[PDB]
Design a protein around this ligand. Structure first.
Ligand SMILES: Nc1ncnc2c1ncn2[C@@H]1O[C@H](COP(=O)(O)OP(=O)(O)OC[C@H]2O[C@H](O)[C@H](O)[C@@H]2O)[C@@H](O)[C@H]1O
Ligand SMILES: [Zn+2]
Length: 282
């Protein structure tokens, strides 16, 4: 835990020049249009623009620790608002363009943004989510569940149970949740396009899931300011702010980025909304 391998921290940022950025985002549009099954992989870099530092960016939690420095939060978990990237993922799921979302983030922002839980895998757990040790019933709170490392919170299951409620925050030794991992892996294996957003892909097996898309000839796209573990394997690497990449992509897709109505929890994906017609490519 003290000894835990925190991988490579504080690598240089890469900034694609704007004409190269414009080009690459058009190409991402073309891949989205060509794909039958698109899966998104998120990590801590999609929340930095909400005030939440990452792990391994220049001001990452682990990076700043390596140097004797403290990470800075510009918000609480509760006051954090989903980013333009978070809201674009909501929209792309609603128009049938996103088959599944896989997140290593515990920041709770995908759920609070209103993203259907039956189309999300929270690999590392969710700070607002406790789970009944007895009946496995999960509870999505309006505040952070106060424990980490799957400890009893002090609340009991109210299901028609009295089970001890625990946090969902994985510790270093903790195996990932079988349910989330299995659906993530299946979605990743069966996808024809895997897009990674603000993750350095250094965690096994979370950071490996995008490579599964590569077998049977799926395409892998990586959006990240820093190098990532699998950059070699990517058909397209875009070095820019995800908010800028996602905003430009949505405009190419003819989609608006919807308003956030404050923290909401959708259990189950709604019926798919209309989407603009597809460009002729060739
Ligand atoms: N606005 C931004 N736009 C684009 N890229 C960004 C931005 N902000 C940060 N990045 C990049 O985003 C990347 C964030 O990578 P890491 O910080 O390692 O987060 P993980 O999600 O991959 O961490 C995996 C797990 O490991 C931990 O122990 C926890 O358990 C995590 O769950 C960096 O490369 C930044 O360059
Ligand atoms: Zn229970």
């Amino acid at each position: 835990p003290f000894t835990a391998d925190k991988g490579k921290c504080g690598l240089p940022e890469i900034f694609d020049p704007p004409e190269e950025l414009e080009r690459k985002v058009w190409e991402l549009a073309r891949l989205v249009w060509q794909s039958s099954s698109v899966v998104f992989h998120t990590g801590a870099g999609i929340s930095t623009a909400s005030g939440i530092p990452d792990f391994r960016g220049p001001h990452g939690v682990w990076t700043m620790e390596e140097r004797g420095l403290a990470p800075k939060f510009d918000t609480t978990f509760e006051s954090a608002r989903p980013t333009q990237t978070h809201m674009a993922l909501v929209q792309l799921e609603r128009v049938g363009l996103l088959r599944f979302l896989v997140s290593q983030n515990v920041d709770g922002l995908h759920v609070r943004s209103g993203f259907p839980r039956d189309k999300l895998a929270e690999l590392h757990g969710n700070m607002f989510v406790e789970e009944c040790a007895k009946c496995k019933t999960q509870y999505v709170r309006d505040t952070v569940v106060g424990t980490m490392g799957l400890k009893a919170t002090g609340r009991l299951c109210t299901v028609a149970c009295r089970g001890e409620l625990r946090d969902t925050i994985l510790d270093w030794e903790d195996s990932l949740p079988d349910r989330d991992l299995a659906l993530a892996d299946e979605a990743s294996r069966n996808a024809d396009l895997s897009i990674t957003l603000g993750t350095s892909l250094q965690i096994r097996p979370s950071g490996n899931l995008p490579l599964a898309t590569k077998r049977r000839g799926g395409r892998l796209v990586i959006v990240n300011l820093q190098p990532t573990k699998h950059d070699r394997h990517a058909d397209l690497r875009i070095h820019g702010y995800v908010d800028e990449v996602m905003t430009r992509l949505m405009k190419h897709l003819g989609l608006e980025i919807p308003a956030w109505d404050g923290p909401r929890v959708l259990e189950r994906a709604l019926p798919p909304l209309p989407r603009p017609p597809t460009p002729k490519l060739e």
